[PDB]
Design a protein around this ligand. Structure first.
Ligand SMILES: CCCCCCCCOc1ccc(C(=O)N[C@H](C(=O)O)C(C)C)cc1
Lengths: 248, 251
């Protein structure tokens, strides 16, 4: 029924809005399309940054991603059926799902020339990011993914359902009861297909093309974790990282 | 019109039968009870293999079959409407990156949880025998089996796979492509054809289209994994030759 499908899609949209402060609609109005309201502060070089450095930028993105994990966790609890799953499976779905969501939503904050930081009050250029040490290789593959992903011109109402599809994957390692997970995802996939067909009636096979993006997403995440343990061989020692590295 | 999509599906299935000598339909008839003029000889250990270095012999055997498969996939690709009209470097690029994703898709038709058909279905090599091979080589086929058991649960037949194999070839996110838009135009048409085919062939099968497309992630990971394993071999086995066609596909 278009009935419960449209009703599920509005439910998820409203919950997405409540859970994520910086929407895509708002990031775009700030980005290359600019409201004549308040320009963000631009970080293009060391002196504008001041106004290790590659390590504190790295650490700042960790702080932000820990915040996002909690925004995504509350969103997932609004997906019908998610909280009725086995508690271990809920934890497993979030553990393996959260990077994919982070890089998905980060694309909403990026264009080919940079990424919004600090709730949109800043803008760090793509060029300044490449100009770092081993840390110059972190954000480039996300910019390359973002550029191709944003070419799909999804909006928040589309991304709300797509994010739920990612969370309810079904193939995460260690799940205990796969069936209700794939049952929920089936119904989310149906809602996503109808949502794309009504929201983008002239965008042929957009559903299929969105699903193909999960390929690049999982490769991006796989690639991110390998660089993450490469720097466990640059930063290594001393103890005044107390509960800090515990929180991360 | 849906009528044009059915004709596209029929064309591709017809070329598939012509290009691939061992279909899933024949593989499943050999594997299951069915025909007993098709019963394979089973290789599960050294002496049954001796009756049909060992690890390397088996690996050169896989290499030859792989080269054979590239030739068959290449023949199939030329039948995909528009493929031969595209720029040449791109045809080559599409084949370079598509070939192994297709080989591991079609290899599932030859697999069950216990082993894999070989020598055009005359033989069956056990999954445990392949895993007991010396070190680097015991690890080649096991992720392939793991993929196949999940992929075979979709219950696709050759007419479904013909269209899916064409979707894979005509990607357009392949590294180094010159003109992406004519590629995506073909793939869009193929995706409509796949979508209609699954809805008609598997009517009671909810969201099979989405589930099948999601499987393109597992294929990408298997190739990536496989490429890492081959780097190990090139260093431990300096007296061993990869095939030129396979060398040029890998970079
Ligand atoms: C069907 C007639 C010949 C039977 C041989 C069956 C052996 C299983 O089929 C395989 C097994 C492994 C591969 C494979 O991954 N080959 C690798 C590749 O081309 O990347 C390496 C040989 C390089 C390809 C085909």
């Amino acid at each position: 029924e278009s009935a419960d499908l449209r009703a599920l899609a509005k439910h998820l949209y409203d919950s997405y809005i409540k859970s994520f402060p910086l929407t895509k609609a708002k990031a775009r109005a700030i980005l290359t399309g600019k409201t004549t309201d308040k320009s963000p502060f631009v970080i293009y070089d060391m002196n504008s940054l001041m106004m290790e450095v590659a390590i504190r930028i790295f650490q700042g993105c960790q702080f932000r991603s820990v915040e996002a994990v909690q925004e995504i966790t509350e969103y997932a609890k609004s997906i019908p059926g998610f909280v009725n799953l086995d508690l271990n499976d809920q934890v497993t779905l979030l553990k393996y799902g959260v990077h994919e969501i982070i890089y998905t939503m980060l694309a909403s904050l990026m264009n080919k020339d940079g990424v919004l930081i600090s709730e949109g009050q800043g803008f760090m250029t793509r060029e300044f990011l490449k100009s770092l040490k081993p840390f110059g290789d972190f954000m480039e593959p996300k910019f390359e993914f973002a550029v191709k992903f944003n070419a799909l011109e999804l909006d928040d109402s589309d991304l709300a359902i797509f994010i739920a599809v990612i969370i309810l994957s079904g193939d995460r390692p260690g799940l205990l009861n796969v069936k209700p997970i794939e049952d929920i995802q089936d119904n989310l996939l149906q809602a996503l297909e109808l949502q794309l067909k009504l929201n983008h009636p002239e965008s042929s096979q957009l559903f299929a093309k969105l699903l193909q993006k999960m390929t690049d997403l999982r490769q991006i995440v796989t690639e991110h974790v390998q660089l993450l343990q490469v720097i466990k061989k640059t930063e290594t020692d001393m103890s005044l990282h107390p509960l800090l590295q515990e929180i991360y």
